[PDB]
Amino acid sequence: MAQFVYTMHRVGKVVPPKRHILKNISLSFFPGAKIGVLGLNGAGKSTLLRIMAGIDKDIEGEARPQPDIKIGYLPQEPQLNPEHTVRESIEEAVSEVVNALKRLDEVYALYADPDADFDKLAAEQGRLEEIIQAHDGHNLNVQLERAADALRLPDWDAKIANLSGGERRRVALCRLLLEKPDMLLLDQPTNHLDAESVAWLERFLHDFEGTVVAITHDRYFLDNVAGWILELDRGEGIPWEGNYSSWLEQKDQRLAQEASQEAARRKSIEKELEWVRQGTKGRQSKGKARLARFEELNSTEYQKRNETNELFIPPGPRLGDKVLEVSNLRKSYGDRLLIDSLSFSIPKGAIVGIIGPNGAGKSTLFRMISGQEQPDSGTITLGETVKLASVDQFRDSMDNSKTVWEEVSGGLDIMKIGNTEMPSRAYVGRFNFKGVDQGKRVGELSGGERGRLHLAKLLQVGGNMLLLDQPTNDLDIETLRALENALLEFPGCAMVISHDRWFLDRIATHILDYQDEGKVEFFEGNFTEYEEYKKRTLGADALEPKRIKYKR
RNA sequence: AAAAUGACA
RNA sequence: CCAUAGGUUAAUGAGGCGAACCGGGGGAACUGAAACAUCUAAGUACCCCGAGGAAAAGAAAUCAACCGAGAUUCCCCCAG
RNA sequence: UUUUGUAUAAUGGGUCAGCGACUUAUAUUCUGUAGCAAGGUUAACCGAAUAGGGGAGCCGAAGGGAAACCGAGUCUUAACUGGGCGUUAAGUUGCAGGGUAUAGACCCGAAACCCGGUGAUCUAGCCAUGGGCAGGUUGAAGGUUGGGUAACACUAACUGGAGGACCGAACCGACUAAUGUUGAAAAAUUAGCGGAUGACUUGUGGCUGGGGGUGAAAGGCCAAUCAAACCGGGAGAUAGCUGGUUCUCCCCGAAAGCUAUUUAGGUAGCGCCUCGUGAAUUCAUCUCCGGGGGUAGAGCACUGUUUCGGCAAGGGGGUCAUC
RNA sequence: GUUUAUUAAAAACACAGCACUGUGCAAACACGAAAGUGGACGUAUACGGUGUGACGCCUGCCCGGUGCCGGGAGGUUAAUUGAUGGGGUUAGCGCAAGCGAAGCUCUUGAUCGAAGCCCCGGUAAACGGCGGCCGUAACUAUAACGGUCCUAAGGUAGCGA
RNA sequence: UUGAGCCUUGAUGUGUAGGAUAGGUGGGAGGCUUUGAAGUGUGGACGCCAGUCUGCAUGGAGCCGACCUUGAAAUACCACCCUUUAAUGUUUGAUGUUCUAACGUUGACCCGUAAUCCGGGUUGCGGACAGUGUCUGGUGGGUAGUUUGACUGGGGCGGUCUCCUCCUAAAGAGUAACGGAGGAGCACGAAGGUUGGCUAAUCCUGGUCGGACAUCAGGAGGUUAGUGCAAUGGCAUAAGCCAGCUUGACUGCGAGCGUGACGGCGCGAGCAGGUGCGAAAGCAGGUCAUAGUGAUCCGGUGGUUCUGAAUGGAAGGGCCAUC
RNA sequence: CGCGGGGUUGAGCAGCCUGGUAGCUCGUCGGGCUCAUAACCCGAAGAUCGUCGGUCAAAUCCGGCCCCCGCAACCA
Numbered sequence A: 001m002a003q004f005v006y007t008m009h010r011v012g013k014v015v016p017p018k019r020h021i022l023k024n025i026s027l028s029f030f031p032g033a034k035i036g037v038l039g040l041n042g043a044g045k046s047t048l049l050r051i052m053a054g055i056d057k058d059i060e061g062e063a064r065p066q067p068d069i070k071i072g073y074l075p076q077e078p079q080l081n082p083e084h085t086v087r088e089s090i091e092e093a094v095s096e097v098v099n100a101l102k103r104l105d106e107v108y109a110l111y112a113d114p115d116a117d118f119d120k121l122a123a124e125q126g127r128l129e130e131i132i133q134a135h136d137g138h139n140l141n142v143q144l145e146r147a148a149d150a151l152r153l154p155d156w157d158a159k160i161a162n163l164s165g166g167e168r169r170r171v172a173l174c175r176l177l178l179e180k181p182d183m184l185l186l187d188q189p190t191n192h193l194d195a196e197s198v199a200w201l202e203r204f205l206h207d208f209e210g211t212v213v214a215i216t217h218d219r220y221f222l223d224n225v226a227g228w229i230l231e232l233d234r235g236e237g238i239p240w241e242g243n244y245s246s247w248l249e250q251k252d253q254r255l256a257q258e259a260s261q262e263a264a265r266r267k268s269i270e271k272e273l274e275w276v277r278q279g280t281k282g283r284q285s286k287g288k289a290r291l292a293r294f295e296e297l298n299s300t301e302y303q304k305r306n307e308t309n310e311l312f313i314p315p316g317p318r319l320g321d322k323v324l325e326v327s328n329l330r331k332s333y334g335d336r337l338l339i340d341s342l343s344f345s346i347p348k349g350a351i352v353g354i355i356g357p358n359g360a361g362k363s364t365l366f367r368m369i370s371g372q373e374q375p376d377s378g379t380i381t382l383g384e385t386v387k388l389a390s391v392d393q394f395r396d397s398m399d400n401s402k403t404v405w406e407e408v409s410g411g412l413d414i415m416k417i418g419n420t421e422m423p424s425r426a427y428v429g430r431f432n433f434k435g436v437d438q439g440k441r442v443g444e445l446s447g448g449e450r451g452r453l454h455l456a457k458l459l460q461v462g463g464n465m466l467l468l469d470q471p472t473n474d475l476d477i478e479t480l481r482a483l484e485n486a487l488l489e490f491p492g493c494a495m496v497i498s499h500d501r502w503f504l505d506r507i508a509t510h511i512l513d514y515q516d517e518g519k520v521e522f523f524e525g526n527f528t529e530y531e532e533y534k535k536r537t538l539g540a541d542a543l544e545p546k547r548i549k550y551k552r
Numbered sequence B: 001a002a003a004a005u006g007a008c009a
Numbered sequence C: 001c002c003a004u005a006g007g008u009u010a011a012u013g014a015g016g017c018g019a020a021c022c023g024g025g026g027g028a029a030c031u032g033a034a035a036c037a038u039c040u041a042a043g044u045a046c047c048c049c050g051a052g053g054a055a056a057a058g059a060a061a062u063c064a065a066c067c068g069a070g071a072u073u074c075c076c077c078c079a080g
Numbered sequence D: 001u002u003u004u005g006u007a008u009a010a011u012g013g014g015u016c017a018g019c020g021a022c023u024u025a026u027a028u029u030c031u032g033u034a035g036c037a038a039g040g041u042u043a044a045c046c047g048a049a050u051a052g053g054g055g056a057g058c059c060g061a062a063g064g065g066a067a068a069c070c071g072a073g074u075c076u077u078a079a080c081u082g083g084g085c086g087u088u089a090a091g092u093u094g095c096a097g098g099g100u101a102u103a104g105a106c107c108c109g110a111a112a113c114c115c116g117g118u119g120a121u122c123u124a125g126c127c128a129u130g131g132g133c134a135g136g137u138u139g140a141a142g143g144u145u146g147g148g149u150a151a152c153a154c155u156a157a158c159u160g161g162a163g164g165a166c167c168g169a170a171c172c173g174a175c176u177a178a179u180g181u182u183g184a185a186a187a188a189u190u191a192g193c194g195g196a197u198g199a200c201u202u203g204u205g206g207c208u209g210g211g212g213g214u215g216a217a218a219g220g221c222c223a224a225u226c227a228a229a230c231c232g233g234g235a236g237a238u239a240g241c242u243g244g245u246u247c248u249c250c251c252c253g254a255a256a257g258c259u260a261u262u263u264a265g266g267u268a269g270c271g272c273c274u275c276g277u278g279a280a281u282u283c284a285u286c287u288c289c290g291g292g293g294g295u296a297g298a299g300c301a302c303u304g305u306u307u308c309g310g311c312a313a314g315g316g317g318g319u320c321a322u323c
Numbered sequence E: 001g002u003u004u005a006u007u008a009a010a011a012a013c014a015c016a017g018c019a020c021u022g023u024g025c026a027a028a029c030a031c032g033a034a035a036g037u038g039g040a041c042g043u044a045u046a047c048g049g050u051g052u053g054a055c056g057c058c059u060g061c062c063c064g065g066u067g068c069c070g071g072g073a074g075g076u077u078a079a080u081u082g083a084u085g086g087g088g089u090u091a092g093c094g095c096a097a098g099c100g101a102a103g104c105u106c107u108u109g110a111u112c113g114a115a116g117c118c119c120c121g122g123u124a125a126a127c128g129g130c131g132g133c134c135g136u137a138a139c140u141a142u143a144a145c146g147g148u149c150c151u152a153a154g155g156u157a158g159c160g161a
Numbered sequence F: 001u002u003g004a005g006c007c008u009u010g011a012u013g014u015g016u017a018g019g020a021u022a023g024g025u026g027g028g029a030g031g032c033u034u035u036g037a038a039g040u041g042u043g044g045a046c047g048c049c050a051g052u053c054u055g056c057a058u059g060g061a062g063c064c065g066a067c068c069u070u071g072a073a074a075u076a077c078c079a080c081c082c083u084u085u086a087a088u089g090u091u092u093g094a095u096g097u098u099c100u101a102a103c104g105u106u107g108a109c110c111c112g113u114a115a116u117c118c119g120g121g122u123u124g125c126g127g128a129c130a131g132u133g134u135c136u137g138g139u140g141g142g143u144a145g146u147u148u149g150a151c152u153g154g155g156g157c158g159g160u161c162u163c164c165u166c167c168u169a170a171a172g173a174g175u176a177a178c179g180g181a182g183g184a185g186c187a188c189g190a191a192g193g194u195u196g197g198c199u200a201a202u203c204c205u206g207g208u209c210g211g212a213c214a215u216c217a218g219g220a221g222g223u224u225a226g227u228g229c230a231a232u233g234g235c236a237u238a239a240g241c242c243a244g245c246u247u248g249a250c251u252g253c254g255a256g257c258g259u260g261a262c263g264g265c266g267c268g269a270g271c272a273g274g275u276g277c278g279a280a281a282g283c284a285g286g287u288c289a290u291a292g293u294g295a296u297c298c299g300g301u302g303g304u305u306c307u308g309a310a311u312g313g314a315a316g317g318g319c320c321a322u323c
Numbered sequence G: 001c002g003c004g005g006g007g008u009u010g011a012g013c014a015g016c017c018u019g020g021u022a023g024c025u026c027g028u029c030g031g032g033c034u035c036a037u038a039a040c041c042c043g044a045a046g047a048u049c050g051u052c053g054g055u056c057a058a059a060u061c062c063g064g065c066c067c068c069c070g071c072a073a074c075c076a
């Protein structure tokens, strides 16, 4: 009884093609409930989040929150100001209190003035004597000095342009949170965070009540916090009570049963078609009712929209012994040194996984490798046979006003990958972009579809020193494993930057571990062999967490 | 663990 | 001994019949809809119970419209 | 009579005489006639009552708009120089008539549905009771006495009298043929045929009732009637379907087409007929004038097809670098 | 032995025998608005239903469809229950405007909620089903044999114009 | 045995730096401490792991406030506790086991009674189940009511049913067959409106890769080109091709006509209010035209006090737009 | 001929599924293992997707031509 924070009733949704990404989803939520939303890229999870937060009311059905609840919505790709700084971007969040202090000091100026002393005050200041109290505008200074510690935000002077990818998400998380809301709706909240930040956030989420609906492709992240699982497969809402391991078997069972029913329906249709095509045998019935039943049996069902399979990677020029060695590399920004005295040499035909904290120079390394930057010391020495192909860390380089096919190919009926040409339509189709899904504008694309398309567009240079900067951005399990199996077959060299060590556990052959002081160390092997190295030359240190919290 | 066959003189 | 159930005994009443009309309990289908299932035929035919010279109803928890009328029953309009 | 069409070998009629089919309330529209006339007229009812009262009410004299509302105007519209509907031409009540509506609705005619009752004296099954089956055969189990065994088993003679057993009359049936089909008979006669101690047959009396009975099962039987008995009622069910429709004279006089249709043999609007009113040199023939055609015919520049020339691509079988 | 009384007496019906299935007794089942009767003054060696039809030798493979039996985890799931949001009215604050307490009403429908169905097994003397194309051996006549596709399984014994 | 709620008792709340696990206001202040210390073992939950709460060991008379070096201060009552939970009460819900008193008894005995019916009385056995009533989901040819189109060179099977183009079609319009051939159930915020500008297919000669055919140059050419999609009629003033600015793909009307049996469908100058393009004259109420479709009823969503059943409101209607 | 289905490597089959992407098992050819052959291992080849033709795009759509495989020919 009681409770019942949020409700959805027969909430359909129709997209321009014709299909219903959501149809007949009727369910309710309760205080202090954690829901994890699963599905595939295209299942409608982000649209459901937008509806639940109330951004869009173009539904059929009802979607009601209980009155007097604060809703914090974290979207797929939060948009900030490339002009702002961290200080003036975070300061926006607590807006009713900065103006409260400013106006209170101005009223402290104007109150001693004998002009309308009993008119300009009783009507105006009184509306602020509690805006400074309920929100507590006096102690925002210590509030920020404390809340900065937990996230370990970038420096206040830092600019958004100078900010790195993970720190940007950190800032956005602080901005969203500071409102102290009840409903917390997040769409993939841990896109760029490392082990420390992800563990901290998934402890804080579990502690924090008020109901949290989280989109996540990460089994380990979901297991800690989720008390309920929403499936959201093909326009249906399947609620599961349990953990990921128990739900995965039920999902597989459902798929197997649906395939069996499909086969049975096929066989029935063959059997009835034979009778329909038989003769007449005299002046007898032929059964108009039976004909109507057979005609009704010809219905349609949705195949799983993207059971995407192994991607395409076209290798290019043959590559020799020199694989762009690096000697005495040192990098800094003003006085902030990222890397000092780094020297290594990648072998031939290897995959090199790069690991480290947020804003430790990982993207900077690719920047100076691709010629965008320069080294403050030493030199990187390219091999003359080396072809470069580096994937940008951010999806935000496409133009949202163009079609998928036009964006990838360039408006050419035949483009070329590497040296051989092959048709552009086939080249895109190799990335599971069928002819129907060809026509959607790249601004109308899910996160995973956008990532796949951007990867497909950039990988057409036909190079052989693939500098992947987090290709595992918004990839599902099957989408991830397709590329994970395609990469192991790459002839050329692959340098991969990522935060999820489980993906790298299957593909990495060389390791670049970042550390403090700007220390970057090379290693040859996989992560189990790295653990073997640590255990052979060990050190007793496991006291990672402290749980700073936010409020006093 | 698997292991079939070889015209007459 | 309880006491009830019960069995003889007396006087008083009703049993059945009859044409129509009347009140009550049940209650069709053919037909029309140019087929038909909601609907109409129709609370009609028919069955059953009960009286009376008539029977039922009947003295506002009724209408009306800020003006008012005064139980019930039947006839002519309202009005197809 | 029905038809495109009948001497038709298409229907109906043996003949006379009698009977037999467009009617009757009410309502509405039009026509003729009669009375009053911007008015006309009453209903129920009262009444020594076809009179006289009764004007409740109905129609008409004003329309427009969905409505408020306005008013010889109104609606539309922000508004019409507009545009739709109206003003400017008399109605109402009887009588007679032609239509339409609700009633059986011009008359005769179904197979069928529903309701209440009468039927198991014929026939289905079953229940209680008591009769019938001439005559002649065959030899089961069993038993006794002998043989055989340690005992059995087995065996021989005698005896015995079983059976949906055998042949065959009464009795019960009904396989073949002939006769008879306005019969002797609304299922029989004649010569043959099956069962004939049994799951038999028969007398008397009971029980099962109509969407129900009973059925050694055929949709068989339930009073000569059964894929739902008979009698009465709803009931003059419905019939876009056949048949029939009664005295006389004068005038005019068609259609078998289009569109639509659960529609093709029905119906509805229009085209074709008749009666009445009002109107224009209204309409028809002919001569002259102003028109636009793309048919018949003709033709091959075009779309195609068709031969014969002289040119000429270009090409194919061999001969070739037989790259 | 029985049957279409009145055009069909039969290969049809019945039958003894066989099998499956239900039924623990106030039995299943049938006639009955019900009381109550038959079953039966019987009691699983009994009674009802269905198929086959003495006797002899036998009765092969398939649980995919459709029925039946068992399971209860999960999905869906009625009546009841009426939390919530929206709307109407208005005592008042205003006296232009608008807001709107308590009550009363219209609507919306949170939670709870069984059997069935989905799902998991069995069952064929339960209703039923029981394959294609191509090559191959001293006359190329045919295939003991092989290749491949599909099925729930590919017709066995015995018969066969 | 338990889910859930409620009320009271306890406990828990470690950013940095003051002192070191500290949630908020307190109200203000030293009082707590002696139902026997700060101190001496450790009980145990937890921890961010320094320890702070707490069972028991003798004695049993102790800490801080205040100063504040940080934003804030001193666990030294009680308050809705604001947070986790830990309990005992406590209401409700479920799942169970036990009982007797409703109820069942087609178990035994007794009486009415000379009665295997019925009733009553004792006694067992079940027992809040079973059973019945109302509501409700499933199943339900066991039973009942009906439907199952038309054209058609007889019916059935086959084909077809609405719209557009050509021919049949007889030089106005219309005109049939199960006659001869093809299409449609759309698209376009530009492919629409103006203002500027431009004009094709094919063939030849020359020329880098490059040829039979890509781009370039100049000659013949003269619409054999093109139209957003079938065919016919059109198109150079282009209705074809290329750009700018654009929203007339406007609102209310509409002289007068074409075509339909009707429902309806089509063309339309001009008038009023605003609008775009152009220097203006002017053009623009969709697309070169002809297919791209569905009446009424019922209901949904916006606007409008037109109406609002005693009155004021409201529900519900009406009208306009639309599904 | 009235109505349906089919045609893909040397054999049997997918892929026609709403067009951008020609595959499978056996078999042919060349090596290897073995005294030698089968089996087994390794490596290759080839298909105008029946045909005439008409969608940016087909094996995939549609019309036709060719051949093959089934079905129906009822009431008198």
Ligand SMILES: Nc1ncnc2c1ncn2[C@@H]1O[C@H](COP(=O)(O)OP(=O)(O)OP(=O)(O)O)[C@@H](O)[C@H]1O
Pocket: A015, A016, A017, A021, A039, A040, A041, A042, A043, A044, A045, A046, A047, A048, A076, A187, A215, A440, A444, A445, A446, A447, A448, A449, A474
């Ligand atoms: N205009 C459009 N036309 C066609 N498809 C569209 C259009 N707009 C959205 N879609 C489709 O609707 C779906 C929206 O999915 P959504 O944005 O929820 O992402 P997701 O794949 O469910 O989740 P996530 O990216 O967060 O992992 C996608 O499949 C997207 O392609």
Ligand SMILES: Nc1ncnc2c1ncn2[C@@H]1O[C@H](COP(=O)(O)OP(=O)(O)OP(=O)(O)O)[C@@H](O)[C@H]1O
Pocket: A158, A161, A162, A163, A164, A165, A166, A167, A192, A333, A338, A357, A358, A359, A360, A361, A362, A363, A364, A365
């Ligand atoms: N132009 C710049 N000016 C100042 N600082 C910069 C600039 N570019 C990068 N940095 C700093 O360099 C550091 C590394 O940034 P980088 O882009 O390499 O991040 P990263 O390690 O890849 O992080 P992430 O996890 O977000 O991918 C950060 O601290 C960032 O603020």
Ligand SMILES: [Mg+2]
Pocket: none
């Ligand atoms: Mg009497």
Ligand SMILES: [Mg+2]
Pocket: C033
């Ligand atoms: Mg009728």
Ligand SMILES: [Mg+2]
Pocket: C034
């Ligand atoms: Mg009729």
Ligand SMILES: [Mg+2]
Pocket: none
């Ligand atoms: Mg009386």
Ligand SMILES: [Mg+2]
Pocket: none
């Ligand atoms: Mg005639």
Ligand SMILES: [Mg+2]
Pocket: none
């Ligand atoms: Mg004739």
Ligand SMILES: [Mg+2]
Pocket: none
């Ligand atoms: Mg003649």
Ligand SMILES: [Mg+2]
Pocket: none
């Ligand atoms: Mg005659």
Ligand SMILES: [Mg+2]
Pocket: none
């Ligand atoms: Mg004659």
Ligand SMILES: [Mg+2]
Pocket: D011
């Ligand atoms: Mg005749």
Ligand SMILES: [Mg+2]
Pocket: none
């Ligand atoms: Mg005659």
Ligand SMILES: [Mg+2]
Pocket: D063
């Ligand atoms: Mg009027």
Ligand SMILES: [Mg+2]
Pocket: none
């Ligand atoms: Mg009937």
Ligand SMILES: [Mg+2]
Pocket: none
């Ligand atoms: Mg008898």
